[PDB]
Design a protein around this nucleic acid. Structure first.
Lengths: 341, 164, 49
RNA sequence: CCUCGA
DNA sequence: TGCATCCGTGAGTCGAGGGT
DNA sequence: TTGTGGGAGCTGTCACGGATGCA
């Protein structure tokens, strides 16, 4: 129902997506698992042809906040002066009088600091919108909700693997490849080594005609049933490979996501379900690679598709480089000295 | 009503985090508690208009999760599902062996009874009506003979082979 | 180092523990004696640095 | 998986 | 932007029997 | 589906290399 990243190309060190898009792996972790929004596209001409009007409206909003702050502060200051005059009219202990004065000054400081926090949030919003660009992360939910409430139609932002798919769509690989070649050729240092590392994968995707979009999936293949056997045990019991339970979890989560989509569910619940779908596909492919592994009965991790190949028990060591054979036997040896060599 | 969906995210989403710790106390499996908590949210959002505002939503949602777990327990624990042995290569195929499929595809010593003792009219019609299981009109087509010939050579070839 | 660990250290071409550096070029040696650590400088005989 | 054999 | 840290590799072969 | 209700179970492993992440 929603695209999913192949955990091999996200969590497999080094993050192949983290090199392709030049994103940090922790930022990729935030984007794919619905912790942070990312800016997929920014409308340059529309932001430039309306910057004057938006800045004007912004300045008026800030002036309004400042005028309200000054009104509140003046009201409180007159109130405090009147109260201290009332106390000075009667017998007023100097220390309790200064307690009242300090309470008033604290209230004023709180008014001013509240107004200043609001003005700082406004400044942050404006400076962020003026410096919007693709591949940028908005980690604050409030900041993104503001940046879409205002200026909403000037850009696009998204979470999850759908946004990574979009970033790969709007990605010009030849441009970044030639940029990295120029950086490597006309420079040196640690940035040179990082650029060589990135150029490895970028040129691998470029020279071959393999689309990088393959790193995100919209459908998952299902291995034939004979390779994930289900056998009837003694009685009503049954036995299955772990692959079947992983496929069952992926299926159930995709179905629940479809239900939530059709039901017009809150964005929070649907994002939870998309995150769970991504995590279950990651378990099906390489369990335990990110976070804790998925466990069956008895806290035992489930053998993933990748486990089938790895280790001495994997297909390579256990079924291809060596096999059990026919026309063969075994027995205890005894010494026969009467034998010939 | 769009006022009900905003009524949901307002005062019931902070409960969603405290319910995860509750569903975990019941399923003892994080992958299962998440499926249970989401299934509770689907069941509560579809019938949110059935909740009366102002009253306790936390006690309402918690009883939804408790009931959908008792149902989900008896629904899926009706069939005991456990794991294969640690090596999957010891799960036996249930096919016949090369020796077993050789002696089972051939025929016994009677293969010379139906070959020589019966006429080729009975031999060819009986061998293709029982082994192949062709329709009565398909065996009519192979030998250019009607039902009167095919159905007869079969009835008589069986009584022929009843001997020996 | 030891036995089989040293064999693995060599076959893997790992930088050995207890490294003994070698000379880059023919020259005159100057070894400064120090209680805690040593230090060496080589002045090449080929007109080098 | 456990216990054991070389 | 220069490393220290953290994370992810790898760690003998073949046998018997009993279990989930 | 109303009035309460957040988990198991682990570390007693070792050596090495290079991406990551922070100062």
């Amino acid at each position: 129902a929603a695209p999913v990243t192949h955990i091999w190309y996200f969590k497999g060190v080094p993050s192949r997506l983290g090199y392709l898009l030049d994103l940090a792996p922790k930022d990729l972790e935030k984007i794919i698992y619905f912790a942070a929004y990312v800016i997929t596209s920014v409308d340059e001409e529309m932001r430039h042809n309306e910057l004057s009007t938006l800045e004007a409206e912004m300045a008026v909003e800030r002036k309004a906040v400042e005028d309200q702050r000054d009104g509140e502060l003046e009201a409180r200051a007159q109130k405090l002066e009147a109260d201290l005059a009332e106390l000075e009219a009667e017998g007023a202990k100097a220390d309790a009088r200064r307690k009242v004065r300090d309470g008033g000054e604290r209230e004023m400081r709180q008014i001013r600091d509240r107004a200043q926090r609001e003005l700082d949030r406004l400044e942050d919003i404006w400076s962020t919108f003026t410096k919007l660009a693709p591949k940028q992360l908005i980690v604050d939910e409030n900041l993104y909700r503001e940046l879409v409430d205002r200026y909403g139609e000037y850009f696009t932002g998204a979470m999850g693997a759908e946004s990574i798919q979009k970033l790969i769509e709007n990605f010009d690989i030849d441009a970044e490849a030639e940029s990295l070649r120029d950086v490597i050729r006309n420079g040196k240092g640690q940035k040179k080594l990082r650029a060589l590392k990135r150029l490895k994968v970028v040129a691998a995707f470029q020279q071959s005609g393999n689309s990088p979009m393959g790193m995100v999936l919209d459908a998952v293949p299902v291995i034939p049933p004979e390779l994930r056997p289900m056998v009837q045990l003694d009685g009503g019991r049954f036995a299955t490979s772990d692959l079947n339970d992983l496929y069952r979890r992926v299926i159930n989560r995709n179905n629940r996501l479809k239900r939530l989509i059709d039901l017009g569910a809150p964005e929070i619940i649907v994002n939870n379900e998309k995150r769970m779908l991504q995590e279950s596909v990651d378990a099906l492919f390489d369990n335990g690679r990110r976070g804790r592994p998925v466990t069956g009965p008895g806290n035992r991790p489930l053998k993933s598709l990748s486990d089938l190949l790895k280790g001495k028990q994997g297909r390579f060591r256990q079924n291809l480089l060596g096999k059990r054979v026919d026309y063969s036997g075994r027995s205890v040896i005894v010494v026969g000295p009467q034998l010939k060599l | 009503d769009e006022e009900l969906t905003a009524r949901f995210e307002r005062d019931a989403i902070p409960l969603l985090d405290q319910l995860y710790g509750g569903a975990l106390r019941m399923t003892r499996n994080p992958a299962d508690a998440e499926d249970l908590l989401q299934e509770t949210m689907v069941k509560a959002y579809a019938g949110f208009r059935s909740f009366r505002h102002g009253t306790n939503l936390k006690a309402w949602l918690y009883r939804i999760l408790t009931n959908t777990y008792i149902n989900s327990y008896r629904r899926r624990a009706r069939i005991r599902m456990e794991a294969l042995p640690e090596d999957y290569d010891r799960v036996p195929a249930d096919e016949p062996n090369p020796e077993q499929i050789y002696h089972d595809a051939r025929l016994g010593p009677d293969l010379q009874a139906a070959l020589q003792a019966l006429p080729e009219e009975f031999r060819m019609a009986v061998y293709y009506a029982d082994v192949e299981g062709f329709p009565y009109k398909e065996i009519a087509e192979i030998m250019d003979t009607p039902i009167g010939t095919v159905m007869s050579r079969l009835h008589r070839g069986r009584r022929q082979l009843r001997g020996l | 180092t030891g036995g089989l660990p040293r064999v693995q250290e060599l076959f893997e071409a790992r930088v050995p523990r207890g490294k003994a550096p070698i000379a880059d070029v023919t020259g005159r040696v100057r070894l400064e004696d120090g209680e805690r650590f040593y230090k060496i400088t080589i002045v090449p005989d080929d007109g080098g640095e």
